[model samples]
Target: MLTEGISIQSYDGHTFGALVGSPAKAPAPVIVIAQEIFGVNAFMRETVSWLVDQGYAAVCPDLYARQAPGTALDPQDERQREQAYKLWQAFDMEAGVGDLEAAIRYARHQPYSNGKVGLVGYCLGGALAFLVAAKGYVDRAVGYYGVGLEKQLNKVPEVKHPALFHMGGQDHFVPAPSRQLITEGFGANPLLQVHWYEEAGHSFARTSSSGYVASAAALANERTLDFLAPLQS
Candidate 1:
């Protein structure tokens, strides 16, 4: 695998850094790994490495780039966690989505890409995957514990690609009512799938978080791998 930190431009001309990894094979399908509230931290880099091991080129862009270029907060630190929440609250989702589109476009045409592109995200990144899934910028998308998707139900009908969402049944960030709204909102979209893990909570898949649940994370990742298999073609 080959890895590097590269710069990419957003739709509004903001240049940001992203960590990219490519498989030994050339022209492989690309998988854009979206960052959690922790930004492009260790877990996100591990995600890119894992995707490369799966024979796909992977990239994780810094979603907080516009606000804080090298923003990789420690999830284990209480103060940093609070800082992350504030960053998330102040972030403009619309602009973040635009930045993701730019990353997709950049990754799609790389010399190591086969033109097909897919995405997987966690937490804040997961919400972005859900939002961008509707924009049809990627061939496949997987979102784990995406928060605030209930409020974006209007985008459900606009989804044009195969998208998968993993929800933690006990997630406080997404309560029962919100989960119900999300489920019902996406019901009409055959291309979208939402799976629930009753035993997990927020950030269940994040190894760096206290909320991490290995079983749930493994199962969700297995499903995500299956969902993204077609991108290899």
Candidate 2:
């Protein structure tokens, strides 16, 4: 069974809020679900639900709580969505990273968590996952088409934890050159595993989106599960 609720804590003496999920147990392997630019919307919640079904204790903290408290955007409306994107950009990356670390710490202390943790993020969350792994906080990490990742190529070399990155070849947000750079960098590292789906676009794995591609998304999710199962165990 999945249990959901809000958590309030004083991190750095400032109270922050989080949305948490898990079965009734302590120290279960945790999966930190990162949200897209849309914040913690229905897609992120569904992702958490799926993780719970997989027997993982999952948590997706509202990273934009300070920017827009309880902000959930409509999947449609390109213009308003862009505005939301800008809000995400306005977030302090360092603070966001700290928030993620705190969430992992919270999961570690949870009854249903095993103190081992993994990360999965879509869009902006994907990029944040990369950063978190690079920062050496989690046991494993998976990024689903995080935008503007290539710009941080130098940090990729610093990432030691096993990581999987899924990219869509047709994704305009992450163009071919950027994708190639990520692939080449990870290839050089030998620790990073990267997959590219030629027929899939950004957010293709998210069922709520019009861009959802069943086959491609299922394949990617399967691959991710294959990678995650061992590490999580």
Candidate 3:
């Protein structure tokens, strides 16, 4: 099936762009890929294609649309990175979640979607997934190195779906104490799982980034695939 762009109208009247991929098979479960700080750039598009290749329809919503519509930036560029941070600083998280919920609804309504929904995200997107999981709208959610999960760590007890989180041990964004903070709040939660990649740091999964660690991303992807199995239709 062709991977193409679609418009998703949010509750707040924002019509954002989303890239979706589908296989020859119709009505497969949907997987939504949340964008990192880089917006729905190359890495995210590849992920949507990969998910569709795996027999699921996937979509990557342009979460930056509200701040700067059509914001697809190169992560490796210094100038673009500065703008991305500004967008982040001004991001309205509640509105963002509303946008994501809109994305989920759109995915479920896709002709190729079987109605079940799963979500996975990286960096800032990971943290967004955490927020969505807490809302209990998605069937399953997996997050890789969520940058700001500490604020929501104690909120895990509220998550209704299966939630898995990958953390990089050397990630300065999440230090030893912060890791322990998350652990202390999430202990023994049947719905939550947290894994730490000892040798990795922030942005460890993106093959195009300097922080990408093949071994760690490979292992993390394994766990992510395993955890997301049931969410597939």
Best by lDDT: 1
- Once fitted onto the true fold, the runs of candidate 3 whose alpha carbons sit more than 4 angstroms away are 1-5
Q: Which residue pairs in candidate 1 have backbone atoms (N, alpha carbon, C) closer than 3 angstroms, thus clashing?
A: none
Q: lDDT of model 1 at residue 65?
A: 79
Which runs of model 2 end up more than 4 angstroms from their true locations? 1-5, 8-11, 24-27, 77-82
| Candidate 1 residue runs with Cα over 4 Å from true position | 1-5
In model 3, the clashing pairs are none
lDDT, model 2: 0.81
Q: What's the lDDT of the predicted structure labeled candidate 3? A: 0.86
Cα lDDT of all candidates, in order? Answer: 0.88, 0.81, 0.86
Error of 1 at 211 (Å): 1.4
TM-score against truth, every candidate: 0.95, 0.91, 0.95
Worst 10 residues of 3 by lDDT: 1-10
RMSD of each: 1.9, 2.5, 1.9
What is the model-wide C-alpha lDDT for candidate 1? Answer: 0.88
* Ten residues in sequence with the least summed lDDT for candidate 1: 1-10
